Amino acid sequence: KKGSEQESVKEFLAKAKEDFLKKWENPAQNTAHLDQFERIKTLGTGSFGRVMLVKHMETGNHYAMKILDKQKVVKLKQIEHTLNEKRILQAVNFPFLVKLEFSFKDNSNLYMVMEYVPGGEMFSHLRRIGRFSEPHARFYAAQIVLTFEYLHSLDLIYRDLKPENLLIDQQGYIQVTDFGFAKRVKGRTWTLCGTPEYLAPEIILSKGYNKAVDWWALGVLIYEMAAGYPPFFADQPIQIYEKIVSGKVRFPSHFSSDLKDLLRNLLQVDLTKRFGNLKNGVNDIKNHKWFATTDWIAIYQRKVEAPFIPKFKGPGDTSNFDDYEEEEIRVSINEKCGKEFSEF
Template sequence: MSQQRATTFIRHCYIVPVHYNVDNILYAIEVTACNVTWTVYRTFSAFQILKNMLVQANVPNLPPFPNTQYIDSSTLEGINSIRIMLENWLHAIMENEYVQHVNAFQEFMRAEANRPPNGIQEIDFSFLSDNDSFDAKSPGSGDDAYYRNEYPELANSTVTVSDFEILKVIGKGSFGKVFQVRKHGESEIYAMKVLNKAVIKKKNQIEHTKTERNILGKIDHPFIVGMKYAFQTKDKLYFVLDYCPGGELFYHLGKARKFSEERSRFYAAEITLALEHLHKMGIVYRDLKPENVLLTEEGHVRLTDFGLSKEGISQADKGAQSFCGTPEYLAPEILNRTGHGQAVDWWSLGALLYEMLTGWPPFYSRDQERLFNKIKRSSVEIPPNLSPETADILQKLLQKDPKQRLGGGPDDAASVKAHPFFKSIDWDKLYRKELPVPYLPEVKDKLDTSMFSAEFTNLPIVSPSSYNRPCTEEIAFPGFSYVGSYAHELQEEKDNAEMEQEDAEEMDGDGQSYASASVSEYSDVDMCEDYYE
């Protein structure tokens, strides 16, 4: 006898044919249990497999399976007749007090929820295991109260993965994936980062993940990615974030090879305002690089990925001890392990500005030891074609002594903003997004993912047939759930209108840092030692 899953008492279902030809019909089955509604997609053969599994499980008093031998499935009339027969059959077996306890039935009604397949051949019904057997325990009343008792966290949850339509994979990293999603009943597009708890624990990144959640929960800035929701299940963590269809700055820099001084100045200025905001909140970013700078549809930047950030840092040169960051952008004081503070972000800004202007980081070597020696000891080579103001700010941002570095003094961002390189920037207008952008991403619409790597966007979104419901015990991640103010208002509207929809299926995820989905998150590219600071 196979191990039984927790029983979901299905109360209603409705079938609609969504694709058909002479040989195959794909049916969309809308399933409801305790006001939770989701959709699964099944072919006729899947119904037959379910019937066989119920027979093998020795379920008594099964109704006869529909006989469609003499029905022409190539006509609309025939398709509708089959639909009615299948729907009536499902309703009949749902009334059988034993069926609801059979794994095959539960998986048939829940697996791959809200995941319309790209093609019929892609549907995997291996979840209907041939060793399923019937457990003759009494099923109880089977009413909605039972379902609420069985899954109280679903009944009380504000938002779950089932509230979202999964559209595309837009990134993948060592901890998981990032999906382009849309909340049911809304037009707004989000990025959903899904992290695997087991991997996070195995790689000793629990505190970093908590830090990212804490920072995202309290940041509200036009040039920093905002978090709309956060929630968790037994196995996964979910961040629902602003979607930036312009993709990573890394993508655009690779395409253009290098940017003009005007374009580089604009991005550097918006990043400066973002860093200023973080520093005022006592946060050192520590992972500024092209992969972590996103572009919005309007051409403005958004910083993302706060997994390596550190809270409680108010000084320029002390407060943090970790060997932490991306090799090409590490400040000398991090490499020297002498302690570091907010000034490391100004070094990284200098490195990023240098790369935007030249196409290369200021110090580069495929050999990591040689790279680190260059960062600690070599002088930066300034291309002769750069303007004097540009050359000067690069020299001052890439000053190896954090106390002498531009931005490294008590004035922090104010000294950076006052540099002649930024003399053309009206900082108030920049903050209000009133200055013209130097480049407008060629985004067709809200769903456009052309600025993301096809390596990710071509990945299938169909997940394994596992059912991970929201957990009641937030093991290692207490207080993770979050609903932003605007999102909370939308949620209340949906609750009042009874428009909320919830899946019974959690999507696959080994989630990536978004928001934009850079290839590496805390991987060998992003390093962090001495993790407990």
């Protein structure tokens, strides 16, 4: 149960925490400027802005630039969340987390220039294909398991796992984007946030909660990859919440019994029985039957052959992304909210 493999991981995470803390306590600020970048096309949106494909004019490399509107962030009381986002993201470093390359701000906006992950959202492909075979889901699930092992070891909760936030890179692996609700926390926290289908019961019930919410959200993810629909759905949020707290799941008849067993233990309503939140931690997931053919180190090093490589014609190609309406990026001549985002 405990061998030298488990000690190899403990040594790596201990070193990764050292790296993370240096960057956590001394974050990078103001590493570029708006007009170092040609703005091409919107790859997606959110409540306070959008991500755009961009070309760094002096290196010619492509990036994805998040743009947040300071005034809107303030209007909606989401300052501390957008501060965590940048702070967490410039500090982490794992093969399945989107690299934050540059960040800066001007009078109206916050900017996070990330690596461009050209394969599109896992969401897009999952809806198109309908569902993923178990081997295909496990390939992706394994990468979330390792990524959570990293993040939780650093005291981070992610809190918004969904296919919409997993992007596929040129070699067919996941990069996690969207750290908008990621938080460093020792102990419990209480904010009602996340995506309705993926919210753990303890979140819905105002009970206060921990890392374990991310392991519930993985059960949902694995289920939705495998079934093609999430285990609790309904037209409006409230009905999804009712289904989630009842703790009744039905499985499609094609799910293997191993998968059913894994999922009944991730979708445990009881915090004390949930895989991930027991004494062996993540090792109860990794040592489960469903993952018995998973070479965890092979997954970390990216030498497993991916079941699906997205077609990319060249750098700057946006065919794996939906189209959105473009807005011009206005920059006011007076400073919006300087005190509030001064650490950004």
